[PDB]
RNA sequence: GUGAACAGCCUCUAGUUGAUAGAAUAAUGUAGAUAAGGGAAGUCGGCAAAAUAGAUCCGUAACUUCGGGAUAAGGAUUGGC
RNA sequence: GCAGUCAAGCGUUCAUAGCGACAUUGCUUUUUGAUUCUUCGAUGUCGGCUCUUCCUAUCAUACCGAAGCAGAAUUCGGUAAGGUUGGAUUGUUCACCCACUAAUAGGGAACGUGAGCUGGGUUUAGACCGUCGUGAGACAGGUUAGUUUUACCCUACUGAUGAUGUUACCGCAAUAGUAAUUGAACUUAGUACGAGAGGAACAGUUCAUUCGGAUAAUUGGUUUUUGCGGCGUCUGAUCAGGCAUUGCCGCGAAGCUACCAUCCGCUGGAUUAUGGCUGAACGCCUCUAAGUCAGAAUCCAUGCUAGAACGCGGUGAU
RNA sequence: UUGGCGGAAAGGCCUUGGGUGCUUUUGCGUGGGAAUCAUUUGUAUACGACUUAGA
């Protein structure tokens, strides 16, 4: 979809990253963003409600040393509304989806964006806290 | 492909080549928009000054946002707008090998106008004692209306000479900026009368430009002076520790061709290019006062245009004014000129208008908004502060 | 008209301005500036003298001492 | 002379203002700092530079020719008075 | 390397949806060889970076044909030159390999690119090992270390200046360059299409990539105007200062640009492949032969910048 | 003198009627009626330029 407003890119590849849920995951490594393009010598940059690819550093053993997609859910770089507000989070974090949209835990843990809420509602059912 | 894998667009567009001083201070509009409408009431153009920049909430309107309705915030440029003194019709015929002006069609009264006609527009500051406009060739109007009666025979889409009086305020400079205006409209006969009655007056910003239109802006960039590739074109910085020269392409051509092509990146000028940015949303055009200002609470609160102490180094905006969206190109105190949108097209885009609810004004910044807080610190101060 | 609140200097917050924490803890907090921002991470407290923001109350000083007293008779 | 961890600044020793100046301050360049947030993705190479820093208290692994490794590591503390 | 012809054959049946041997004719000059024309009073090596311009044998996008095209992923092919990631290993080119993507094409410009960089390999001088050699010492064997000169005369071009001519401005426009790309998602539709599974189009809508231009409200960064904390040392003291980086150290502004801060980007006319019209030669048939309609991201126009030495006119004139 | 046409400007001209006649520069002379600089500065800018104020 449309997000519906503009950030701008915190986290390039091979950032360390926060994993917002209790899927086992402690902690995610970006290694891909599935929709970026880019210029020479130059890195793809992934922000706030984009799918990455990643693979969990700590994390499940089954999804350590695997790659599985994740939506980055809050992030430490700020974000820029439609009112005007710039919104920031503490830290960097995601939680883990499949491209194919397919599992990896019940529940989260800290806020998510509105935006990513909207985006993928799935997420959003899973949430104590929008902001 | 002999190089690069990893081929990327170049950067820095050739059409906005010659990257290099303007001709002119001013901007000149090549083309204007079709004679679609009413008559010379409906001048193509108008000009300005800009004054800074400001922000304005709005009534939005996209509807397919969630974001969508409320007031939403729009970054608006303010451009002082004086009452513009058509002075003539000049007449401009088409044939082939290009137009010439038949005529001038006077005023009785561009009085300093035509001594600012005379300061860079003839030469000498007040110099050596004169310099000269020669008077009204006892009256031969008669010269100029025989003129006149030459260009309804034909066509040039009929132009006006046009000029701005900077004096207003912001300005130190008293000089107007001479222009050449087309007129559109209707059919020819009468556009050339309408033409005509609006010579004998001076002429708004609110006959050229409804509020909201979408208005063409030109003008003419800041200047840098003479820049390198890299900030120029935008082209890298070569990081290495070290280099002979660091901020450096690497190649100018190749071995084949010699030569240093002029499609390459090279240092030179920068800045003082004319440029033309299309489709701006006119938000208000107003006076300080006695058109209007802010309703109160609601729609939303009056508020001055300016920023306190002013906009730095313009100084302060009381008068007619033009709010225009987004940028304009320029710096401050510098010439803008303003079109009807020549694109017709047609598209989606804004389509419906953004009621006023703030302008700002501020009154910030450590403090703010307007009538209380200046109230506020004033107790506070008080000596210094105003008001006793 | 809108306006938003400074949970750091307590003035207002101008509307169209301001920048939104969100925090770990999920505490959410409203600065004006960025002036306001930065001493929040440095755990400069308002209070403390920021601008002197949050302060600005009244009250205060004596009248009167002398003895602060016991005894003495 | 204060520091003695190096550094810096001094004072009655004493010594001097190098053989070019003036006006300005653009890019380019050469020394140089600081940078959002991210954090080696850059480069042959983490090259540099940042970084850590004194000292006290507590604590201290594998291995080992038991001498060492060892300031391992890690953490805490320190003012003005 | 690629193409053409022929078409044995295979594709359930079917040469030609697709695949396609033997044979055979070509084309290109970008691998490799061959040569010995050029340079031994000297052409700097590979590779990489970055900047440019190009090519068509087109990987994607546009328009189209065919299908063994139900949808739909698709396969093959035509027209067509107006984007083509980031990384790990390696010096690597090449390649392997990973997640991305619309798809992550191939080729040339002295293997484009050292009076630009790099210096990792090749390829000096020291050294080790395997191997060979009586030995010195040698290997297209491996390995560690091992330098990058020059102040631009001419030319080429970014930019700036700049007279003849009756003068200053303002304009014209011969012309030059020439920006728009692409994706996702919604409606449209869980519809068409289909046993079902699955799953489209068109346009209207919103947003984002990628590019370009611009700006400095917003808000980031800066901040060696200035003001304040606190360190040593110094002028008796505090108070007031000095030096300690070019700002001692910590704290922030205007201006200046960017952290995608923030604003703005088509339609006609002509065509290609083709699909059609009217239509003969050849009474029929036939999309072309004469004629003609449509039809690409094409062409041109539209859009912008530059533009009186195309050897300029007004106007405004002493 | 009258005037049109062209082409818009210029130009350039071309027509119907009456008063007299034919058949590129280079000065010696006569008659007729403004910039650039300094000086302050920029909306600039390397030098120049431009831009700007002046009882």
């Known amino acids: ?55 969990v550093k700590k994390g499940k053993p089954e999804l350590r040393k695997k790659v599985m997609p994740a939506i980055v859910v809050r992030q430490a770089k700020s974000w820029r509304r439609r009112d005007g507000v710039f919104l920031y989070f503490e830290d960097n974090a995601g939680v883990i989806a499949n491209p194919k949209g397919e599992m990896k835990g019940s529940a989260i843990t800290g806020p998510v964006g509105k935006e990513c809420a909207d985006l993928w509602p799935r997420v959003a059912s899973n949430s104590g806290v929008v902001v | 492909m002999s190089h690069r894998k990893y081929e990327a667009p170049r950067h820095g567009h050739l059409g906005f080549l010659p990257r290099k001083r303007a001709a002119s201070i001013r901007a000149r509009v090549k083309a204007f928009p079709k004679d679609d409408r009413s008559k010379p009431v409906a001048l193509t153009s108008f000009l300005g000054y800009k004054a800074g920049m400001t922000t ?37 015929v088409e044939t082939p090998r290009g137009l010439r002006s038949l005529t001038t069609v006077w005023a009785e009264h561009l009085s300093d106008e035509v001594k600012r006609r005379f300061y860079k527009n003839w030469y000498k500051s007040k110099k050596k004692a004169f310099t000269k406009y020669s008077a009204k060739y006892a009256q031969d109007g008669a010269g100029i209306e025989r ?99 660091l901020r450096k392409v690497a190649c100018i051509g190749a071995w084949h061709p010699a030569h240093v092509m002029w499609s390459v990146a090279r240092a030179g000028q920068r800045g003082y290019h004319s440029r033309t940015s ?40 009381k008068n007619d004014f033009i709010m225009v969206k987004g940028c304009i190109p320029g ?49 506070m101060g008080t000596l210094k502060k105003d008001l006793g | 008209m809108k306006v938003e609140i400074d949970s750091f200097s307590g003035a207002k917050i101008y509307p169209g301005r301001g920048t939104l924490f969100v925090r770990g803890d999920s505490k959410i907090f409203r600065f004006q500036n960025s002036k306001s921002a930065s001493l929040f991470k440095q755990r400069k407290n308002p209070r403390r003298i920021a601008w002197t923001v949050l302060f600005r109350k009244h009250h205060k000083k004596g009248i009167t001492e002398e003895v602060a007293k016991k005894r003495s008779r």
């Open chain 2, 331 to 379: 710096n401050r105190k510098r010439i803008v000129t303003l079109r009807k949108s020549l694109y017709t097209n047609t598209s989606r885009k804004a389509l419906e208008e953004v009621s006023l609810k703030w302008i700002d004004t501020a009154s910030k910044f450590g403090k703010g908004r307007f009538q209380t807080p200046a109230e506020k610190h004033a107790f």
């Open chain 2, 147 to 245: 003129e006149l009666a030459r260009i309804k025979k034909y066509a040039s889409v009929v132009r006006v000479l046009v000029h701005t009086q900077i004096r207003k305020t912001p300005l130190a400079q008293k000089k107007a900026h001479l222009a050449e205006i087309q007129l559109n409209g209707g059919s020819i006969s009468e556009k050339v009368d309408w033409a005509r009655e609006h010579f004998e007056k001076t002429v708004a910003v609110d006959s050229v430009f409804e509020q909201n239109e979408m208005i063409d802006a030109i003008a003419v960039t800041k200047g840098h002076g003479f820049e390198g590739v890299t900030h120029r074109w935008g082209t890298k910085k070569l990081p290495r520790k070290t280099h002979r020269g």
């Open chain 2, 56 to 92: 304005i909430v709005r009534d939005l309107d996209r509807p397919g946002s969630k974001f969508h309705k409320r007031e939403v915030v729009e970054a608006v440029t303010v451009v002082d707008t004086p009452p513009v003194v058509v002075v003539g019709v000049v007449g401009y």
């Open chain 2, 278 to 317: 299309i489709n701006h949303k006119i938000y208000r055009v107003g006076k300080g006062d006695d058109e209007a200002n802010g309703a109160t609470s609601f729609d939303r609160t009056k508020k001055t245009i300016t920023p306190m102490g002013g906009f730095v180094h313009y100084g302060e905006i």
């Open chain 1, 1 to 55: 979809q449309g997000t519906k407003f503009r950030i701008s890119l915190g986290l390039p590849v091979g950032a360390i990253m926060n994993c917002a849920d209790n899927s086992g995951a402690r902690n995610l490594y970006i290694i891909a963003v599935k929709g970026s393009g880019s210029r020479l010598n130059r890195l793809p940059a992934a922000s706030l409600g984009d799918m990455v690819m990643a693979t």
